[PDB]
Design brief:
alpha/beta, Rossmann fold, 3 domains, six-stranded parallel β-sheet, 13 helices, globular, binds 5'-guanosine-diphosphate-monothiophosphate, binds chloride ion
């Protein structure tokens, strides 16, 4: 229950689940993780290590060099004693009709990650631990329920609430561009990031944008002194290391919300959680001999309620991940109260379960949307639902209805039967959903 400040080998005994909240300067990846891994190899424990991103996974692979650790960059079925993969890869593996190894040790890094695949992985793991099959270590500086937006750092951080631009500006924010150092700017969305980055670029700044779809390749560009701003969504809350001296934090996020069980809207921008604010601020103050890092933030914090879609989507995943004796994993208890749904409420019959996973893995659809289409009895290749919805579900592209040529040869207005705002959030999202609706892409 209570987080612990340092690793101790008793945490590796079955039924133990520990939240490890390491102090600044502890060297989690380079010092603590190899100690845990060596002790795991020592006691012949089948172990998996779960990184939030491929960037962190690559950092772990380096830190663990010379140890028998196998890094699985993709969710392909495999079947030397320590596996390494991303949270998302792990959950994708759980969905395959192949049993995942009987790991007796799970190590999850940046275990505060609130994406549905991470929530689902935490529920599966905590269930395996509760059943005496394994031990688990959840590593995070911001465990569930944290209310401290201003935790300790290696060096003191100068915190100041300011007006943070939410749109492009032409004047009135000279403190933004008068800065001569490096700034990480957290924005609530890709579209907002696009508008802010363009404005900084117009002002002569060298900007790198980061988001979930681009993160691995664009994060590489940060590894040099060749930039003035990183403009990033919340994805950089999950262990992204920057050499910066300032964070500009909107303190805002978008929240996917299922309205009346009929549609998903992206509500907000609204205040971030305390954990998110702490992690954003946590990009700086990291050098104990470099004072003066600055955290400029645009508003207050607020805690999630039950209307956030990711926890329902995690239950949709876990209901369709088998265990022995037909068992269904529960959410990790600190998060279980974020949904009203019970284990099994979303468990689909075999053929519709298969379509559900196809829409997610092949179709790149959000979990909620994939579930609506699968549970309606629609097969994966039937794209008619993308066009026969209410006019109220028309997706707009440049202030006119978006239009798609189907592989059958008709031009159709994009009007999905179920509307999930995430498929048309940004240009990259829409482009993908358009290719999906065109029946062109079976991936
Ligand atoms: N390039 C480089 N960076 C280091 C080295 N040791 C620590 N750092 C970086 O200094 C920062 C502060 O270290 P620390 O407080 O221990 O954070 P940490 O997250 O536990 O450190 P780690 O998991 O990345 S090893 C981190 O960003 C860490 O990556 C090092 O040997 N080389
Ligand atoms: Cl993103």
């Amino acid at each position: 229950e209570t987080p612990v400040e340092c690793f101790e080998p008793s945490m590796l005994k079955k039924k133990q689940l520990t939240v490890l909240d390491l102090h600044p300067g502890a060297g989690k990846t380079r010092r603590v993780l190899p100690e845990i891994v060596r002790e795991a190899i020592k006691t012949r424990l089948r172990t998996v290590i779960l990184a939030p991103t491929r960037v962190v996974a690559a950092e772990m692979e380096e830190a663990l060099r010379g140890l028998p650790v196998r890094y699985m960059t993709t969710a392909v079925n495999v079947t030397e004693i320590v596996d390494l993969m991303c949270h998302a890869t792990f959950t994708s593996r759980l969905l395959q009709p192949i049993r995942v190894p009987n790991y007796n040790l799970y190590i999850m890094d940046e275990a505060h990650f609130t994406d549905p695949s991470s929530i689902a992985a935490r529920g599966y793991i905590s269930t395996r631990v509760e059943m005496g099959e394994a031990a688990a270590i959840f590593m995070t500086a911001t465990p569930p329920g944290t209310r401290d937006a201003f935790p300790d750092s290696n060096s003191p951080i100068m915190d100041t609430e300011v007006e943070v631009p939410e749109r492009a500006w032409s004047s009135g924010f000279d403190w933004v561009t008068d800065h001569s150092g490096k700034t990480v700017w957290f924005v609530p969305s890709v579209r907002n990031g696009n508008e802010i980055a363009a404005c900084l670029t117009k002002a002569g700044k060298r900007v790198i944008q980061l988001s979930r779809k681009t993160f691995e390749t664009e994060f590489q560009k940060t590894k040099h002194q060749e930039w003035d701003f990183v403009v990033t969504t919340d994805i950089s809350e999950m262990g992204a290391n920057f050499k910066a001296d300032r964070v500009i934090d909107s303190r805002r996020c978008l929240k996917p919300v299922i309205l009346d069980g009929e549609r998903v809207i992206l509500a907000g921008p609204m205040p971030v959680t305390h954990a998110s604010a702490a992690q954003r601020r946590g990009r700086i103050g990291r050098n104990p001999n470099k004072p003066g890092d600055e955290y400029l933030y645009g508003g207050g914090c607020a805690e999630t309620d039950e209307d956030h879609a990711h926890w329902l989507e995690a239950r949709m995943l876990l209901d369709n991940i088998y265990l022995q004796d037909g068992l269904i994993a529960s959410l990790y208890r600190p998060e279980a109260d974020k949904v009203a749904a019970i284990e099994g409420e979303f468990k689909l019959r075999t053929e519709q379960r298969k379509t559900f996973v196809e829409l997610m893995k092949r179709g790149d659809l959000p979990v909620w949307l994939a579930y609506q289409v699968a549970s309606a009895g629609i097969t994966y290749t039937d794209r008619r639902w993308c066009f026969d919805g209410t006019t109220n579900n028309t997706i707009m592209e440049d202030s006119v209805p978006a239009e798609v040529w189907t592989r059958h040869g008709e031009k159709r207005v994009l009007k999905p039967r179920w509307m999930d705002a995430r498929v048309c959030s940004d240009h990259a999202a829409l482009k993908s959903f358009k290719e999906f609706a065109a029946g062109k892409r079976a991936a």
